[PDB]
Amino acid sequence: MDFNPSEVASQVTNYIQAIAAAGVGVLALAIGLSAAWKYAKRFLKG
Amino acid sequence: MDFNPSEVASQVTNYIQAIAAAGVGVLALAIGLSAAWKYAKRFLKG
Amino acid sequence: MDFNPSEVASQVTNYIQAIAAAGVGVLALAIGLSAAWKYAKRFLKG
Amino acid sequence: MDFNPSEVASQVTNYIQAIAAAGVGVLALAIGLSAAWKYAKRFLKG
Amino acid sequence: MDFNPSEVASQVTNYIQAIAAAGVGVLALAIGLSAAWKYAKRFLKG
Amino acid sequence: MDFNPSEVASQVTNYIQAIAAAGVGVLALAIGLSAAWKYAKRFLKG
Amino acid sequence: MDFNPSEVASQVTNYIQAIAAAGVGVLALAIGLSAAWKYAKRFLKG
Amino acid sequence: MDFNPSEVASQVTNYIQAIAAAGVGVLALAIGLSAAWKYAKRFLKG
Amino acid sequence: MDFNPSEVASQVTNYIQAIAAAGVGVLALAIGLSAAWKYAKRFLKG
Amino acid sequence: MDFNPSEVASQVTNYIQAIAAAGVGVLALAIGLSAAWKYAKRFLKG
Amino acid sequence: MDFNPSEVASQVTNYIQAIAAAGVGVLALAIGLSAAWKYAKRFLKG
Amino acid sequence: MDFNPSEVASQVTNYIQAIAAAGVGVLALAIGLSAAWKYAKRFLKG
Amino acid sequence: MDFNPSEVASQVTNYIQAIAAAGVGVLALAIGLSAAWKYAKRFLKG
Amino acid sequence: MDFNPSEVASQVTNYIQAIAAAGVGVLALAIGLSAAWKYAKRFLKG
Amino acid sequence: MDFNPSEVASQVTNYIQAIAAAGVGVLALAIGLSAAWKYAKRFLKG
Amino acid sequence: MDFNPSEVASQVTNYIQAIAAAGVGVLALAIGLSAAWKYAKRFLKG
Amino acid sequence: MDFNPSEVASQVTNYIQAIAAAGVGVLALAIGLSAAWKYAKRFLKG
Amino acid sequence: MDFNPSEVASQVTNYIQAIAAAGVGVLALAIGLSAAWKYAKRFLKG
Amino acid sequence: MDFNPSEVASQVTNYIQAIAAAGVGVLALAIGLSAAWKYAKRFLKG
Amino acid sequence: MDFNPSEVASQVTNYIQAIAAAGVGVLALAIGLSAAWKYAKRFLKG
Amino acid sequence: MDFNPSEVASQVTNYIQAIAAAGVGVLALAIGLSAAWKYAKRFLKG
Amino acid sequence: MDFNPSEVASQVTNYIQAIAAAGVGVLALAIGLSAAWKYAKRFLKG
Amino acid sequence: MDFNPSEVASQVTNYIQAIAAAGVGVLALAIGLSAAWKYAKRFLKG
Amino acid sequence: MDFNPSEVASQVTNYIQAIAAAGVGVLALAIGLSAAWKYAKRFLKG
Amino acid sequence: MDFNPSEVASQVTNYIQAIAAAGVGVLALAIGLSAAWKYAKRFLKG
Amino acid sequence: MDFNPSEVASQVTNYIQAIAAAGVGVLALAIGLSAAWKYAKRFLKG
Amino acid sequence: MDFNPSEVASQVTNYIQAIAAAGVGVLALAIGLSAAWKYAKRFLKG
Amino acid sequence: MDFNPSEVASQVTNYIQAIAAAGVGVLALAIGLSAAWKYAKRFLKG
Amino acid sequence: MDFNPSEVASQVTNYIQAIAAAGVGVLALAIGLSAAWKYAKRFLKG
Amino acid sequence: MDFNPSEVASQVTNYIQAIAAAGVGVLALAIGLSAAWKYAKRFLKG
Amino acid sequence: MDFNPSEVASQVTNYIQAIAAAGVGVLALAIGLSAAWKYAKRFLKG
Amino acid sequence: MDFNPSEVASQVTNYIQAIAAAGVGVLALAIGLSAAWKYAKRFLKG
Amino acid sequence: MDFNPSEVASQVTNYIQAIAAAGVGVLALAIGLSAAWKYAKRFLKG
Amino acid sequence: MDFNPSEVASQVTNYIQAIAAAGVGVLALAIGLSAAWKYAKRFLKG
Amino acid sequence: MDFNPSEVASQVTNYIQAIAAAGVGVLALAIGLSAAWKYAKRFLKG
């Protein structure tokens, strides 16, 4: 025998792996305009 | 199975795509007078 | 559906269109004496 | 049989759809002066 | 039925409409001297 | 509705109209001796 | 009811009315020597 | 019968109505110097 | 009964009244040299 | 997709094209007397 | 739309047209004795 | 695995590349009259 | 209300009136020997 | 409206009218001996 | 496009053409007695 | 109450009154040699 | 035994190492025009 | 890539090329009478 | 009780009193050569 | 009887009274250099 | 008892006292060249 | 590792190298007429 | 034991050491033309 | 006897000792760019 | 007995003492270029 | 390109060619009696 | 203990000491031609 | 108050009074031989 | 690299070379009658 | 208190007093030969 | 305590004392030829 | 370490060394005709 | 320490020493014919 | 290094050498008839 | 202290002392033939 929290509690392990790709696209994408927003919004001003 | 943060959390992905056109018209338009404002406001002075 | 930043965030679009007429009258009018100020103030000197 | 969280827990699905129109009018409207506030408040200064 | 964020959350809609008249009088009035301040303060100098 | 930069931002419009009469009396008056200063100061020399 | 930004936010309205008299005496007075400074300082030179 | 959250939970309804008058006097009053603070503090500088 | 934000939240009302006298002496006094600084610093130059 | 600073930020491009004709008439016209002012004012002197 | 530097910035255009008549009377008049000053002052000498 | 800030956060990288061409046309174009403004405005004066 | 550049900016108006009497005594007095200098210096020569 | 260089810049117009009477008395008077100086000084010589 | 210093800066071109006729009448006329002054003044002497 | 920019911002009012006496002694004194410099430097030359 | 926050909590350690290269390219690139923007935008002005 | 100050900042390059022809006609033309003015005005005197 | 911005915020009141003596010595001293610089540098030239 | 939140919950009432004196000395003292910092740091610059 | 924000929160009181000596040496020293920079940089120019 | 401000922040290094050639052509070219303008405009006068 | 902010928080210590060399090359290089820009741009003018 | 919460409940005592080294590396490392981020990101801007 | 928050909760007391030396080196060091950045970056400009 | 002082500055070239015919008639004509004046006036005397 | 802004914030103290030698060579050197530029450029003219 | 150009600008008034005695001795003395030079040099010739 | 004031600032070098031929024809030609004017105008007189 | 432009701005007052003795020796001395130059250079001629 | 702008801001006080000796040698020396330039250049002419 | 304004800010040092050769050729060359212009233009006149 | 305007601003000191030899050769040489021009041009006339 | 007024300002040195041969031919030639004019015109008279 | 126009502006004092010996030799020498020219040229005539 063993305790079964180990193989099966782990599924979450994928719960956190999946968001990296879409999860990031949201900040990757929010952040995306976030830094560009400074120049795109900034440089014509001078 | 899979986790469904991926197809459906993505809708936001359009939340950020839509502002580029109107979102920009505001700085595009604020910025619009912002650079023109310098010459239009500047050159008659000399 | 769509996101509604597009029709309604646009109202500002008129916020920037209105000043062109009064907004300009101020520099149009400040600038107005600004270039005239040079000759009107300058030419009698010679 | 099935579990009934699916048809009936969904009503909320409209709870989030309704605010897009009024919900946005508040930022659409707060934001509305928010970008216009910069030029309307800015350009006469030059 | 419907959700009631729509009729009643809207009251704010007037919260933003009222300042346009007094709200503007402050920049309208701060700005008021702000552009005039340049000539009134500027032109006697030449 | 409309935006109120137009009736009330205009007050400055008088800020620039008033100096023409006193504003000019200063150059009108500085300039006044400025051209006369040349003959009044010049012609006895010959 | 109404929102009370309108009667009470207005007090500033006097904040801008008061400086016209002292506020001007400073440029009225700085400017005062500013134009006179040119002739008073200029004309004896010829 | 009915459920009594409706007549009696409403008392709060006055909890929010009362601050508009004093509640505003604080921003009305903080804000009061806040816009005036710019000219009163600004215009003598020129 | 009534809600007591009204008599007692008001004390701040004096928090803003007191600075007008000392509060102003600082800009009144910073500003004090600020406009004088221009002539006192300017006029000997000509 | 693309970023929209390019078509719409360009409007200014006309902001600078328009002054060439009126903008120049002011120096064209200030300058106009400026060179003529030398002979018209100069040659009778000899 | 158009930019309004063109109709309204032009007012100066009259700022330069008006001096030709008075503006000239000053050199017309300073110059007036200026050439006459040579003979009127010169010819009796021989 | 890797972290995905690297491929997707980069899009901004084009946000800054695009303005060089239009972005510059504004100073390229504001600056354009800016240096020319000195001779075009200067040389007839001599 | 009115703008107060008009009564108080005018003080200069006396700044220019005072020099006529002393201001002139300097050319009146420099010029004084200036024309006399020609005969007083000239006529004994013949 | 009009520009006020015209009524008030004109005062000089009298600046040049006054010297004709005293202004001339100086050459009228310098010149006065200037032609007489030739005979008065010349004729006894023969 | 072109730069507009060329058609409009040229007006001066007439500023110099006009004096030839009146401008000359002054030397034409000052010079007029100037050469005649020698014989008219000279020949009776012999 | 009142706003206190009026009694206390005024101190500058003396900042400008004091230089008239020393302030003038500098041009009064620079100017002093400035007009005298012409005769003192000029008349021995003839 | 030991506690396992140490080997596995560390993965973040790479979360911060990766942005240095792309992370910097954004300021490296925003900053990139940021300093160049001053000369490129500045020097033609003189 | 490259920086675009080089092709587009250059337009000014024509701003300076155009005045040579009209620009010169003004001194070419002011200067024109300027040297001729000496003989035309000088030689009849002898 | 009272609010303590009044006795203790005032210390600055001396922050502005101290510079008058050293603060002035800098312009008093920069200005010192500034007016003297004109004659000391000017008068030997004649 | 009564409920005892009233006499004993009040002790805090002193918790807020004590900071006014030290609490203020920190902003009184931070603020202290904060306004003085502007002139002390500003005026020598002119 | 008492509340202990008073003796111990005060340590900061020295946090602000220490910078006056080094803190000032930085502006004392930045400012140091700042006023000297004007003459040292200015006077040789004349 | 290292920090990457060093290779990539440097790109600007070319931002400043490019203007030397076009950047100079503008003053090289403005300056170009600027010194020539003195003789070309000066020497015929004698 | 000790707290580990001391060895490891320090890495930044190099974050600030690295820019001195590239960081300076940007102002060293912007500033580079900045002082040279005055003579290179200035001296041919005389 | 004794109660055994004392030797064995203590193991946690190491639970808190271990994070100081890795635990800190995360803020040590997050903080690491956090302060450096200000200069590295700030100084090229001037 | 006593409560043991007093000897052992205090360890933090060193948590705050340690950063003063490294903690300061970061602002000491960020600030370090921060004031120097103004002159080093400023003075060559004049 | 070339510099245009050469074709257009030349017009004067005719300014000097025209007087030879009228210019001479004045001395040709003044001189005309000038030599004849000796015999016509001389020979009858013997 | 003490606060460590004092030893370490001071490094800047050298930031300002170093420019005196190179910093001056730029004005020392710009200024260098600046005064020499007047005679070297001036004296041959007489 | 009054303007102080009047008592103190007057000192020059003595600048012109002093030369009459020495100033004249130079022409009085140059002129002195100037008329005597004719007889003293003339009469022995007959 | 090098600085480009040297090849391109030189163009003026031709600005001064061109006038020698036309530039001289004006004095060559003004001077032309200038010496001839003495004999042509002189010798018949004897 | 008072403003300290009065005791310390006055030092210049000696800046103008010192040149009278050396300052005059230059014209006293330039002028010295200037009147003597006429007789010393003139009288032997007769 | 006191504020330390007074001992340390004063260093500039020497910044202005040092130029009097070298600072003057430049005008002392530019001026040196400046007055001598008139006689040395003038007197041989007679 | 050291601060790097010293090796790299120096490049300007060559910015000022290069113009001496071309920079001078412009005045060397403008001045070149400037002194020659007097005799070449002067001596034939006698 | 010292301020370095003294050793290095002095270089100009040679800027003025060098022209004495060439600088003089121009007037030495212009003046050279200038006095000789009178006899060489004068004496054959008798 | 050296200053380059010396080799290149010298070109004028030839500007004065060339006229001796043609320059003289004009007086050599005007003077030529000038002395001959006396006998050629004189001797037949006896 | 003193102002240093007095020892060093004086050098000119020798600028005027040196010409007396060579300066005079030119008139001493021009004048030399000038009086001798009358007898040497006159007496053989009788």
Side-chain angles (χ1 to χ4, degrees), chain b residues 1-16:
Chain b
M1 187 196 178
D2 263 287
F3 167 29
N4 68 331
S6 303
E7 303 138 271
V8 182
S10 293
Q11 303 191 125
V12 184
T13 294
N14 281 212
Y15 284 60
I16 302 134

Side-chain angles (χ1 to χ4, degrees), chain g residues 1-21:
Chain g
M1 187 196 178
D2 263 287
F3 167 29
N4 68 331
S6 303
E7 303 138 271
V8 182
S10 293
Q11 303 191 125
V12 184
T13 294
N14 281 212
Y15 284 60
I16 302 134
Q17 283 198 176
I19 282 194

Side-chain angles (χ1 to χ4, degrees), chain f residues 1-39:
Chain f
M1 187 196 178
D2 263 287
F3 167 29
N4 68 331
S6 303
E7 303 138 271
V8 182
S10 293
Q11 303 191 125
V12 184
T13 294
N14 281 212
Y15 284 60
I16 302 134
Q17 283 198 176
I19 282 194
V24 163
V26 174
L27 282 297
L29 289 278
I31 282 191
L33 282 65
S34 282
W37 193 270
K38 282 232 311 210
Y39 167 152

Side-chain angles (χ1 to χ4, degrees), chain A:
Chain A
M1 187 196 178
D2 263 287
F3 167 29
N4 68 331
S6 303
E7 303 138 271
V8 182
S10 293
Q11 303 191 125
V12 184
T13 294
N14 281 212
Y15 284 60
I16 302 134
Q17 283 198 176
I19 282 194
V24 163
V26 174
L27 282 297
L29 289 278
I31 282 191
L33 282 65
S34 282
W37 193 270
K38 282 232 311 210
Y39 167 152
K41 303 342 162 306
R42 282 254 284 146
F43 284 101
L44 294 204
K45 282 26 198 164

Side-chain angles (χ1 to χ4, degrees), chain g residues 17-38:
Chain g
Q17 283 198 176
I19 282 194
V24 163
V26 174
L27 282 297
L29 289 278
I31 282 191
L33 282 65
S34 282
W37 193 270
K38 282 232 311 210

Side-chain angles (χ1 to χ4, degrees), chain c residues 1-16:
Chain c
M1 187 196 178
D2 263 287
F3 167 29
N4 68 331
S6 303
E7 303 138 271
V8 182
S10 293
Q11 303 191 125
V12 184
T13 294
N14 281 212
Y15 284 60
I16 302 134

